[PDB]
Amino acid sequence: QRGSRRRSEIPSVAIVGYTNAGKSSLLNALTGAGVLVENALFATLEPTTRRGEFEDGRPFVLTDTVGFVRHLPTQLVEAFRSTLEEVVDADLLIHVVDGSDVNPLAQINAVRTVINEVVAEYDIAPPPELLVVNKIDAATGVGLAQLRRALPDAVFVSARTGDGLDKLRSRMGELVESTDATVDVTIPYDRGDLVARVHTDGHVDATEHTDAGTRIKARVPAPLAATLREYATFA
Amino acid sequence: MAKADKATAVADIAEQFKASTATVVTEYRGLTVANLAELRRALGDSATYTVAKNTLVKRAASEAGIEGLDELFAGPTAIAFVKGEAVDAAKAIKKFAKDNKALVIKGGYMDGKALSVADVEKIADL
Amino acid sequence: MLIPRKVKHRKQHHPEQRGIASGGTSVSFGDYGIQALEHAYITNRQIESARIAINRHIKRGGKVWINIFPDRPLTKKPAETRMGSGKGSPEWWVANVKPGRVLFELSYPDEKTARDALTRAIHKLPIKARIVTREE
Amino acid sequence: MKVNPSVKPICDKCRVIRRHGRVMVICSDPRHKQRQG
């Protein structure tokens, strides 16, 4: 199923974190899904995905995984090895930690050493890690500045209230568009299976009706950017 | 499709004929609602207009002297009930006859007299 | 699930599945109902599983009545043991059903969605059953 | 084709017929066509 849905051009982002980190409600509040939650342990278990939406008008694959617990046996890690395959299939990995706690250094240390186990045994480059503190309304401002100084890649969020969601899309935007390869293609007149593709599948830069054809400066996704290299304007 | 609704139609159509003087009957087919909305504003200013069933007309025509259109009830029936002067609605429709040219007049009736298509043109001329 | 709070006797005989129903053969709370046509021991799981099925098709409004309650216990001894030496502990609670008994009842504005909701629950019961109305 | 004991019309353009002693559903959409057995 993934081997037929990876062929498409949908960016994939993964949300991971401890149990009762509010990862389920983050997907509910960012999209509008009615995924049910319980203020207890193992609120959600199935690997849930739904569409993601943006400020600039881009869809992506937003994947909710299973919640972790501390001192997990590797037997249970292997038991849920089916739910954690999306970790390496993620363009961007979003990490959410308990913002009301004492030791954000331990929360990142435990999960990252858990996830990099799978990255190492799957031998792919680790994704750009992003941390999201939750419950800024239920958190103390002293620790807010401590992670401000320590992690510039950290962002304050309170999904239970909804502050700073527009900045999340901007941060999500700059790091997802960054994997694409800008192209300068010249599509001829006998390949008219591309005019709608360059306008909606990718991002347009400029367009001119030259003699050799239409010199289409454009930005297109990874399976769509290494793809027009035949008609490249320079080496 | 209970018969009571059709029975009320037969009484009403005849009573409007006996309340009106003349008629002009054309083909309604192929005319947009935008045209139908445009015409109904001009149609209802003085006259009235309906698109009823041929047999509903016949059972609502046998009472009074509007049985002089039996052989002409074959085709798309579009009654333009002109109540006042018979030339008002006949002049407006001849505007639409030239405006559209997809409408062809089937016939008309006035003063208990049976006419033809060319006679109707003269009626719109009178 | 539905279980009784306390039952005077914990290990009872098997309920007799003979004869036709003599009570509860008329819908008396809602508008539509399910009428049984075969004897069965409808456990508390099939009662609750069918209850969710009706709710998931109306999803907004209406009330569901369950006139049947799993009172009787049914026991089983541990597997891979020879016969004799006692009687097993009660495991699943069932409710005796005789044909003619009205099992579930629904109250919903439009009939088509009401009957389709009931047909969803009927397909989760161990019996043949039909849909009966409030009217005569 | 879907070989199922329980073939039903799925869309509003699905016709259910009999062809050589088998109940089958035939539709414009190839996804819908199915036979009994």
Partner: protein, 176 residues
């Protein structure tokens, strides 16, 4: 039965023959021969028509009513005016040529394929990308055109292959 109610109108240009249930019609194109089912009987009225007669309302006899009427109907409009079907071929590099009583296709295969002409069926090429099949028997004309149309596995991505005249085939977008 409503289909079989009306009678087949014979024209001035053919002669019919009814010897029991072996009805044969001959005219300006050919000679066609037919046999009907045993309940049904067929004769002709003196007003230039052929009539099929079912004596019962049994399910078997009611189905053979409509079947017999259309068969004689096509037996008449065939032996006199005949049938033609206009076939088209689509895709770059796809052509057709005529080799006497045969047809040669070029449908992207390594080997140019041949289609023989069954008797009473005449191939008539018009343009390299459009042709027509004509004949006397409606059953045979539609049979060979069906084989012709199936010379390429269906392609909904670009529609390459032999199609019918006013076809609107199902297509889809082949993206990735």
């Amino acid at each position: 039965s409503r289909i079989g109610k009306q009678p087949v109108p014979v024209p001035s240009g053919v002669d019919v023959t009814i010897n029991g249930q072996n009805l044969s019609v001959k005219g300006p194109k050919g000679t066609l021969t037919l046999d009907v089912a045993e309940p049904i009987s067929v004769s002709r009225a003196e007003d230039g028509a052929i009539v099929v007669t079912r004596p019962d309302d049994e399910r078997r006899s009611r189905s053979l009513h409509g079947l017999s009427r259309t068969l004689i109907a096509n037996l008449v409009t065939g032996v006199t005016e005949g049938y033609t079907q206009k076939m088209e071929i689509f895709g770059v590099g796809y052509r057709v040529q005529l080799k006497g009583q045969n047809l040669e296709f070029a449908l992207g295969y390594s080997h140019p394929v041949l289609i023989e002409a069954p008797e009473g069926i005449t191939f008539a090429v018009e343009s390299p990308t459009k042709f027509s099949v004509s004949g006397i028997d409606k059953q045979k004309v539609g049979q060979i055109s069906a084989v012709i149309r199936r010379l390429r596995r269906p392609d909904p991505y670009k529609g390459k292959g032999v199609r019918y005249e006013g076809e609107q085939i199902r297509r889809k977008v082949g993206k990735t």
